[PDB]
Write a protein that binds this ligand. Structure first.
Ligand code: ANP
Ligand code: ANP
Ligand code: MG
Ligand code: MG
Ligand code: ZN
Ligand code: ZN
Lengths: 434, 97, 665, 655, 52
DNA sequence: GGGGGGGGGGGGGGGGGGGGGTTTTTGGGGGGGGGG
DNA sequence: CCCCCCCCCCACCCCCCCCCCCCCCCCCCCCCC
């Protein structure tokens, strides 16, 4: 078996070391450039893997859960060969996959896709904390102190049942000092709204990412995913098991504020395009034309909507006082004056936004709500529309039909940019920059 | 609509399906309480959309109402319309007074 | 390997489709080449199951329902053809398939027996294969009130018509085959739950012995169904006129049929000796006596009330028990302190014949309906009045020969057949003066005594306890009859010299060994002993010389061990035991031999309120015995304090002190 | 005489059942081989009376759809080799096992290498003749095929479930052969066959295979359970192709196997050896589909010059007059074209209608008819509708212990109609929930940490009485009814229904009503065929096209046809809207707004839809203008209605 | 034929001498025949009990 | 002819292995009470 | 009298147990005195 695994590993080593287009060894260069900035991963385009040697892609797509670890191993060996002098240490490199295969919509994924590489898209509705998973367990026997170690690959693992040569019935314990761990995050992906069938409730999948794919995306972002559609045996029918996606690649339509507040991401070409756009003399008129272009007239409202999107400048003073930077606009008036259509456009164009209707809202449902975590039996705080809109806009349509004590709950978050909760023994002032 | 989940508890006009429902002191019933039976009166059904429970329910019922005149005393100088707090939507639903 | 088995079962299923089926134009209709198919199935029985010792065809044929769904329809419709034609008279061909159907019925109903010589496959398949024979018995009796039985007698009448001279060996065989069919249909009985004993028993034993398949009930199999269907098909009339016509190739199966009728039915059940409801009230009162007894053995307050008695003994030491009633009754406290022991002494253990009176539970009655009782009793009455003496003479005139090759089954069924009808006619004659003892006169012809003596002596010498027990039973009824004809009056004097010496010794030695065997073995030993003693007393070579051979401790151990079952014995049996004690103890005055503590305990347990019926005649006899017994024991202890210890032990066979222990000077 | 692995029997032998039980007979291999040939012969040689093999055509279609399911009609099996039909009823678990293999063989014969597309076929039995209610299930139904009706009360997610599973023994040679997983019990391995001993076990890693799974709670339909009694229910299990063929609140008819199993929980809490039970589904039904000939019939009748009028006359045929209401209902029920301008601006296609008027004028009956006729429909009278019961609600999930959404009526009827009878009786907090779903065609809940927007693509038709119970033609509309302008403007056709005494009109209406009552009396070639023929004879007296045809025609026109505007009389619609706006300055009048301008276009598109015409003609637009102008004019008080109708006549009486 | 199973027989007694109330339950009457009256406050689903 | 010794079966005890072990917030409906 | 508000109720070691194995005890049979 390990002879064949060695041949697979050598085949991938050759793919990294030999693949070349227009005089550039793109994977050698990418691996080196990643090593210098100390991200130990490689992004592979499966078009290139198919083009190199379609037998390799056949092995990978037949059984990715066995072949992806071997590819990662190959990447480690090349990483050492191109960044450490041979005969004068690095972790196991994550493999990230880019693909243009035909997507399966989230609702169509089923038993025929188990253990296959799958491509899909949706909106991330939740992101859990960074749990820790072992890559390498240092192990020893509780009685005779036989010491060994278990390398782990996270594609579906256990300790051994009895000692590897009396030691008692269940003999092994972990040694955490010499064991190694990685970040693991859970995301919940909900299917695209315009792809939901007629009269159906929108379906969602739990899915996991690890190493450098953690914290890459945040709730509300629309994403496309490459991953192994796979199963886990929950503690809860008969012979029934929970589906999930082991993520191998994430590609958001755009990246915004995922784990960054002062950091940014812009290319030189788009920065220069924005710079020469900023210098245009008719810029305000062009932006006003861009707002809701199929809505006639309402020019001062469109001008105000540009101002609301842009916002002012937030300020913090030696007093300690904070001055509100964002802008609030109310459209009050007659029926069919395109107010709701304008709110729809603003929710569509803003980089961060939420749309709610006042009669569909709640005080908690808007600012933030207390929840009880069921198996912990303990209270925690979950964000409402103001939290999800933080750093952007909340479009409160149908505002006059909001119940008054729901309406009053907006006051602090609307002026002080904060939500002062005091409930169930929780006391916090969450930020809401909306 | 009650918990046990959300589910439907049969009222009087459900229990008298293929039957007779007798409402005493009908006139004292609030208009909010009166207008609820306009469907069971004539369409022979009750339709509900509440709390995630949606149904239409059979109320094939002959209703017998025992209204008082307004002020108790029946004023013989006034119309039957004038002697009651009912109005044409529900009076047209009765076969006879 | 099991591939051969699925090939076999496939073949039998295809054959099952070839026999025939219903026709919608409902009537059953034979298949094309039906005679060849029936012949091939008979071939399968011989070819595989007999010659290879398997019973796989016998299982597969039950799986594909050939008997119930083809052969009985064929026979019943053929019977209808012949019976409808008989009022009006290609039958010459259909007669052949009717005969071959009866051959197949005799095969599939053949009485299964398992022994050490049976193959591994046979002993494996035995338990489930029996169940299908029970289904066959149900269907044969029930279907159209059992008109197949009328088909069988018609097949027999079609040789009885041609003369005793005319009947060829094939005709004789066909008649014998019909008798085997009747015998088999009587003989099927539920199998025994044969547990494997390699692995130890769990904390709960076997859940139930019931072996009947789910479409059968024991009432379907009961004698009531047999008697009803046989009456409604006049099988009894056929058998009666057949034995009337005995003037012998078929005599063994006819004997065997009468055995299989009689083997498990008690004679007194056929005689009375609102009435059912009145007797139900009597039964309810009898168990209400047990209720007023167990009530005194029950706490007047709840179980957790738990007041503690302490028994201080005659010495300076104390025991403790929680019995709330026992606080006021040391009798209860003592026997509870005894029952509290976790210890029990370990106890010891201990086929080619059916169950019978030889081995049933001692009170196991057959619950006739009144009509079935009438039909059965009148049938066996007419048999006694016609067929008994000739049939017994026929079979005993055989059985004097070939005793060496008489298989054990044949021996036991013969002895039981003799005994049952002798006992019955004695009872019917004790009831009705119109019934004659001489109507069973063949029992007393000396050839019969010689044969039954030979069977008993040989079985005892050969240590065949089964035939020994049956011959003992036969001796009991022979002596019963002999005593009656002694009163009715030469043959009595003749046998009363022939049972001298070796026969005295043998009969004396049965109840020496009997204590080791089942309750029915002991019961037959006691019954024989009482019959022997009353016969010898009626004669009264010397009386003391014979009875001294009985009055010894192994016989007393048999008597005590039999009497341990007193709650489950019948009152007459307790009377018989206590009449034996009356002779031995009061009259023969070997009273030392009964001063032993096993009897003392047994006397108290039956004289206790938890023992015998307060109004029982046997209770009166035990009380009458016990007063005199206690008086004599009191006297002997006053004359011998050594006997306070001697009471615990076997008496001393060292005669030099043994005589002094026995009589005390 | 015969090879034992190929011994086989005649059909009369199969009727001559002679095992102890049906299942023992089906599994007897000579019988099993014969049954295989029998069902194969049925699928080959059973024909329609046109001589076509039905199952030839269905297998052809199955492969064209790449389906795993073959629809078999039970009655076709009762019509030929009926012993197989009896076996199928009495012993479906074995018989379907054989019939599936036969169906796979038949399609592999018809489509070679269909094993590459699906390795297995499931015969989905339909038209099983005998039906039970969930109250009516009993012990005698156990392991029988049953046909049951109910409402899907609670649908769980779609899961993979093991189908064929090998196991590993940790002792000896590990791998154990593939067990087939059922719907009720885990595989129990009492001992390992390879070492004939107990042991621990794990699912094998070398190979295992999965099938889709989904439980459904099926409950007594609320009108079918007798009053006072509680609704009974059973768990239904959907496997493979059947998952998500239904959604919560839908009434369904289920064909399946009523099975049971030991469950220590049921025994534990009840104290008797009493078993849990399910229905393992083999078919699910919700009537609005069509055949190629039915499609041709729609195409044929669509050519008729009077087809819009024949449709309109056919709307609610047993209601006299009210041709304006029938037009409004027709326009609503066909609907406009929903549009999306480069993805940057989405526009409502649904047409909302308000039936405002006097008592005893068939408004509720019209709404009940529309509930009868529309392909997705929901009905909720007045005080019976809460705000969240109309749009959507959040509940603390009882088994998941978390918040989840529950779709209201406007979710259930998405791409359909919602029917609010006695609309004026609603509480205003309930009424104002309608707004977002009624114009933006969505519901945006934000509650309990849930934040999302649902689709609510409904045409809402509502029926109301005026204030005080009766209309007043000396008052303008806003004084006749308490509804505010933002909700009135969303109902973009208004029909005002006045009950006036008028001698010959009442004569004609009363004549029609008494004729309808005798024409509806219950007492008023086989008998069933004759009765259906008599029903058609009765129906053609009042419906110019068959109602059964009209439902499928509506569904066809809705799903296939999307009329474009072209050659537009832009100046005419502009002048119509400009004049409607000017004359609507009357303070109480029907509040003309831009959504009414778009309503003209929706209505014209719906009329082109009625013709199955992918372009809107001038006739469609002119009829739309006539409807909208008449709806506006009709709402005006008598003091001005003649002058306004005369003024507007130039746009409408030119048609 | 396939073996149409043994029929079970329910022996439904009625018209007893007296009616006991729910409060009159007393454990000497375990195993005895009674008639009982009350009002049905709830009912189970009808289920199969394993008998034989 | 009875008692001792040898041999076989059956039962019991001990050891070893294995498996099991409520208040607080949010939303919704319905009922009751107060103000114009 | 009607409508709106607001109030209420509801969702890893230790013990018990079971299985397996070994030895001892009790009975039966055969031989010897
Ligand atoms: N100026 C306009 N240009 C284009 N379309 C318009 C304009 N005004 C209204 N509409 C159309 O009319 C509808 C406007 O609906 P909407 O956006 O809800 O208006 P609104 O101001 O929110 N009225 P309301 O929700 O009752 O207060 C949409 O179908 C628009 O396409
Ligand atoms: N034009 C008509 N043709 C036939 N039946 C009619 C007509 N108008 C009224 N009816 C009958 O009137 C009865 C009541 O109809 P319904 O639909 O309840 O009227 P409505 O408009 O809803 N009145 P209301 O509920 O008080 O607002 C039904 O049984 C109809 O058959
Ligand atoms: Mg709006
Ligand atoms: Mg109405
Ligand atoms: Zn160890
Ligand atoms: Zn194993």
């Amino acid at each position: 078996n390990d002879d064949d695994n060695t041949e697979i590993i050598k085949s991938f080593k050759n793919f990294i070391l030999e693949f070349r287009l227009d005089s550039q060894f793109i994977y050698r260069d990418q691996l080196r450039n990643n090593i210098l900035v100390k991200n130990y991963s490689l992004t592979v385009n499966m078009e290139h893997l198919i083009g190199y040697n379609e037998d390799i892609y056949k092995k990978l797509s037949d059984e990715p859960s066995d072949i992806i670890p071997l590819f990662e191993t190959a990447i480690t060996q090349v990483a050492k060969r191109i960044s450490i002098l041979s005969r004068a240490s690095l972790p196991t490199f994550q493999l990230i996959l880019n693909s243009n295969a035909n997507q399966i919509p989230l609702r169509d994924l089923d038993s025929e896709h188990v253990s296959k590489i799958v491509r899909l898209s949706g909106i991330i509705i939740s992101t859990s904390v960074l749990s820790s998973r072992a890559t390498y367990l240092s192990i020893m026997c509780r009685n005779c102190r036989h010491t060994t170690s278990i390398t782990i690959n996270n594609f579906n693992v256990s300790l051994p049942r009895s000692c590897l040569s009396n030691c008692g019935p269940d003999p092994y314990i972990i040694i955490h000092e010499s064991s190694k761990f990685i970040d693991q995050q859970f995301l919940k992906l909900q299917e695209i709204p315009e792809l939901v069938p007629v009269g159906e409730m929108p379906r969602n999948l739990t899915m996991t990412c690890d190493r450098y794919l953690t914290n890459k995306v945040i709730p509300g972002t629309r994403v496309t995913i490459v991953g192994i559609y796979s199963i886990y045996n929950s503690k809860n029918g008969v012979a029934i098991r929970t589906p999930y996606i082991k993520i191998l690649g994430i590609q958001s339509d755009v990246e915004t504020s995922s784990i960054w507040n002062s950091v940014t991401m812009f290319t030189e070409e788009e920065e220069e395009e924005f710079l020469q756009l900023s210098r245009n003399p008719k810029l305000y008129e062009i932006l006003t034309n861009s707002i809701a272009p199929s809505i006639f007239g309402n020019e001062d409202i469109k001008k105000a909507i540009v101002c609301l999107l842009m916002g002012g400048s937030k300020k913090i003073l030696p007093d300690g006082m904070r001055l509100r930077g964002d802008i609030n606009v109310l459209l009050l008036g007659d029926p069919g004056t395109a107010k709701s259509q304008l709110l729809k456009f603003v929710e569509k164009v803003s980089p961060i936004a939420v749309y709610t209707s006042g009669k569909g809202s709640s005080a908690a449902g808007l600012t933030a709500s207390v929840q009880r975590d069921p198996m912990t039996r303990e209270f925690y705080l979950e964000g409402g529309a103001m939290v999800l809109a933080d750093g952007g806009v909340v479009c409160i349509d149908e505002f006059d039909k909001m119940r008054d004590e729901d309406r009053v709950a907006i006051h602090e978050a609307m002026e002080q940019q904060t939500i002062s909760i005091a409930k169930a023994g929780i006391t916090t002032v969450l930020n809401s920059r909306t | 609509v009650v918990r046990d989940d959300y589910t439907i508890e049969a009222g009087a006009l459900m229990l008298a399906d293929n039957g007779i429902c007798c409402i005493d002191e009908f006139d004292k019933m609030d208009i909010s309480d009166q207008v609820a039976i306009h469907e069971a009166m004539e369409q022979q059904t009750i339709s509900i959309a509440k709390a995630g429970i949606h149904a239409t329910l059979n109320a094939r019922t002959s209703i017998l109402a025992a209204a008082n005149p307004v002020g108790g005393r029946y004023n013989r100088k006034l119309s039957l319309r004038g002697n009651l707090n009912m109005t044409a939507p529900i009076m047209s639903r009765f076969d006879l007074f | 390997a099991d591939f051969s088995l699925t090939v076999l079962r496939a073949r039998i299923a295809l054959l099952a489709t070839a026999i025939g089926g219903p026709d919608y134009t409902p009537p059953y209709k034979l298949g094309d080449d039906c005679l060849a198919c029936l012949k091939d199935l008979k071939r399968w029985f011989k070819l595989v199951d007999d010659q290879q010792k398997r019973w796989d065809v016998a299982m597969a044929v039950a799986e594909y329902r050939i008997l119930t769904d083809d052969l009985l329809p064929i026979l019943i419709d053929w019977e209808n053809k012949c019976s409808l034609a008989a009022k009006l008279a290609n039958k010459a061909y259909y007669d052949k398939i009717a005969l071959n159907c009866l051959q197949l019925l005799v095969l599939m109903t053949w009485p299964l027996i398992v022994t050490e010589q049976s193959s591994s496959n046979q002993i494996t398949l035995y338990g489930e294969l029996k169940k299908h024979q029970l289904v066959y018995k149900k269907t044969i009796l029930s279907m159209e009130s059992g008109k197949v039985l009328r088909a069988a007698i018609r097949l027999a009448l079609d040789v009885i018509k041609i003369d005793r001279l005319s009947r060829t060996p094939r005709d004789n065989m066909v008649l014998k085959l019909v008798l085997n069919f009747f015998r088999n249909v009587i003989a099927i009985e539920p199998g025994e739950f044969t547990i494997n004993t390699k692995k130890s028993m769990p904390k709960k034993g076997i859940t139930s012995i019931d072996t009947l398949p789910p479409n059968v009930s024991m009432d379907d199999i009961s004698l009531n169904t047999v008697i009803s269907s046989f009456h409604k098909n006049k099988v009894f009339g056929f058998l009666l006129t057949l034995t009337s016509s005995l003037s012998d190739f078929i005599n063994i199966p006819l004997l065997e049929i009468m055995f299989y009728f009689t083997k498990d039915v008690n004679q007194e059940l056929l005689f009375p000796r609102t009435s059912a409801g009145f007797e139900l009230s009597k039964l309810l009162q009898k168990e209400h006596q047990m209720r007023k007894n167990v009530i005194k053995h029950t706490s007047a307050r709840h179980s957790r009330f738990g007041g503690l008695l302490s028994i201080q003994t005659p010495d300076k030491t104390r025991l403790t028990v929680s019995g709330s009633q026992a606080l006021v009754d040391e009798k209860i406290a003592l026997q509870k302190l005894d029952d509290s022991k976790k210890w029990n002494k370990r106890i010891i253990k201990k086929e080619g014949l059916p169950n019978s009176l030889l081995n049933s539970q001692t009170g196991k009655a057959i619950f006739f309906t009144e009509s079935n009782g009438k039909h059965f009793k009148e049938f066996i009455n007419n048999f006694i009045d016609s067929g008994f003496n000739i049939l017994l003479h026929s079979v005993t005139n055989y059985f004097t020969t070939e005793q060496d090759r008489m298989v054990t089954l044949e021996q036991v069924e013969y002895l039981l057949f003799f005994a049952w009808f002798v006992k019955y006619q004695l009872l019917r004659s004790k009831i009705d003066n119109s019934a004659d003892i001489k109507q069973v006169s063949e029992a007393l012809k000396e050839v019969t005594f010689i044969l039954v003596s030979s069977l008993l002596r040989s079985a005892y010498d050969l240590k065949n306890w089964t035939v020994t027990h049956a011959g003992m039973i036969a001796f009991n009824e022979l002596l019963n009859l002999v005593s009656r004809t002694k009163a009715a009056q030469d043959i009595e004097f003749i046998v009363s010299r022939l049972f001298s010496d070796e026969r005295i010794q043998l009969l004396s030695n049965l109840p020496k060994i009997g204590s080791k065997y089942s309750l029915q073995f002991m019961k037959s030993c006691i019954e024989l002993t009482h019959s022997v003693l009353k016969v010898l007393e009626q004669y009264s070579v010397n009386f003391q010389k014979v009875q001294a051979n009985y009055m010894t401790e192994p016989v007393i151990e048999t008597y005590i061990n039999f009497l341990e079952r007193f709650r489950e014995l019948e009152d007459d049996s307790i009377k018989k035991v206590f009449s034996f004690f009356h002779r031995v103890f009061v009259q023969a005055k070997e009273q030392a031999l009964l001063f032993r503590f096993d009897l003392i305990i047994l006397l108290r347990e039956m004289l206790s309120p938890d023992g015998l019926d307060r109004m029982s005649r046997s209770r009166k006899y035990v009380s009458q015995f016990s007063d005199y017994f206690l008086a004599r024991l009191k006297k002997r202890l006053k004359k011998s304090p050594a006997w306070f210890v001697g009471l615990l032990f076997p008496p001393l066979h060292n005669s030099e002190v043994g005589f002094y222990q026995r009589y005390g000077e | 005489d015969i090879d034992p692995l190929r011994e086989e029997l005649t059909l009369e032998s199969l009727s001559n059942v002679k095992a102890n039980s049906y299942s023992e007979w089906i599994t007897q291999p000579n019988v099993s081989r014969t049954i295989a040939r029998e069902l194969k012969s049925f699928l080959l040689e059973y024909t329609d009376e046109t001589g076509r093999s039905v199952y030839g055509a269905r297998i052809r279609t199955l492969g064209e759809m790449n389906s795993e399911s073959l629809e078999v009609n039970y009655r076709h099996l009762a019509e030929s080799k009926a012993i197989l039909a009896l076996f199928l009823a009495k012993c479906p678990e074995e018989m379907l096992k054989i019939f599936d293999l036969v169906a796979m063989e038949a399609t592999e014969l018809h489509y070679p290498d269909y094993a590459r597309i699906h390795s297995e076929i499931h015969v989905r039995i339909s038209d099983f003749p005998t039906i039970y209610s969930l109250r009516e299930l009993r012990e005698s139904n156990l392991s029988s095929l049953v046909r049951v009706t109910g409402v899907v009360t609670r649908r769980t997610g779609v899961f993979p479930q093991l189908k064929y599973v090998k196991f590993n023994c940790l002792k000896c040679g590990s791998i154990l052969g593939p067990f087939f997983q059922d719907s009720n019990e885990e595989i129990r391995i009492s001992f390992c066959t390879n070492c004939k001993s107990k042991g621990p076990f794990r699912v094998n890693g070398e190979k295992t295979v999965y099938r889709n799974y989904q439980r459904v709670t099926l409950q007594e339909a609320p009108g079918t359970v007798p009053p006072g009694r509680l609704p009974r229910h059973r768990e239904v299990i959907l496997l493979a192709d059947l998952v998500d063929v239904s959604k919560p609140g839908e009434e369904v008819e289920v064909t399946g196997i009523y099975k049971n199993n030991y469950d220590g929980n049921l025994n534990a809490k009840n104290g008797f050896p009493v078993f849990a039970t399910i229905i393992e589904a083999n078919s699910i039904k919700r009537v609005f589909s069509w055949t190629e000939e039915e499609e041709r019939e729609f195409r044929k009748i669509s050519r008729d010059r009077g087809i819009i009028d024949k449709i309109i006359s056919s709307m609610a045929p047993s209601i006299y007059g009210h041709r304006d209401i029938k037009t409004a209902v027709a326009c609503s029920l066909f609907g406009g074209v929903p549009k999306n301008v480069n993805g940057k601006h989405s526009i409502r296609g649904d047409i909302n209608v308000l039936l405002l008027g006097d008592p005893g004028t068939a408004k509720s009956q019209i709404l009940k008819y529309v509930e009868k006729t529309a392909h997705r429909a929901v009905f909720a009278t007045g005080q019976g509708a809460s705000a969240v019961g109309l749009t959507a609600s959040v509940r603390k999930d009882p088994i998941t212990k978390e918040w989840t959404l529950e779709g209201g009526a406007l979710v259930l009827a998405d791409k359909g109609v919602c029917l609010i009878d006695e609309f004026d009786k609603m509480n205003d907090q309930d009424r104002t929930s309608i707004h977002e779903a009624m114009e933006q065609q969505s519901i945006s809940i934000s509650k309990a940490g849930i934040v999302t927007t649902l689709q609510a693509r409904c045409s809402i038709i509502a029926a109301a009485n005026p204030n005080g119970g009766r209309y007043n033609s000396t008052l303008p509309l806003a004084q006749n009814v308490s509804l505010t302008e933002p909700i009135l403007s969303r109902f973009d056709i208004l029909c005002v229904v006045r009950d006036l005494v008028d001698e010959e009109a009442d004569e004609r209406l009363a004549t029609f009503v008494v004729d309808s009552h005798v024409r509806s009396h219950p007492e008023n070639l086989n008998a069933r065929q004759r009765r259906l023929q008599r029903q058609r004879k009765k129906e053609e007296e009042i419906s110019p096209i068959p109602q059964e045809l009209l439902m499928k025609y509506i569904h066809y026109a809705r799903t296939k046809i999307y009329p474009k505007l072209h050659q537009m009389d832009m100046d005419k619609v502009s002048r119509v809207y400009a004049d409607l706006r000017r004359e609507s300055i009357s303070t109480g009048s029907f509040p003309i707004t831009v959504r009414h301008l778009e309503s003209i276009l929706r209505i014209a598109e719906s009329f082109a839809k009625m013709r199955l015409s992918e372009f809107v003609s001038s006739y469609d637009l002119d009829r739309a203008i006539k409807v909208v102008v008449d709806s506006f004019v009709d709402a005006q008080k008598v003091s001005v209605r003649r002058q306004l109708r005369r003024s507007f006549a130039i746009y409408t009486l030119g048609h | 034929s396939p073996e149409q199973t043994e029929r079970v027989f329910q022996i439904s007694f009625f018209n007893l001498p007296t009616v006991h109330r729910i409060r009159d339950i007393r454990s000497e009457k375990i195993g005895s025949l009674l008639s009982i009256s009350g009002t049905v406050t709830r009912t189970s689903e009808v289920r199969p009990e394993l008998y034989k």
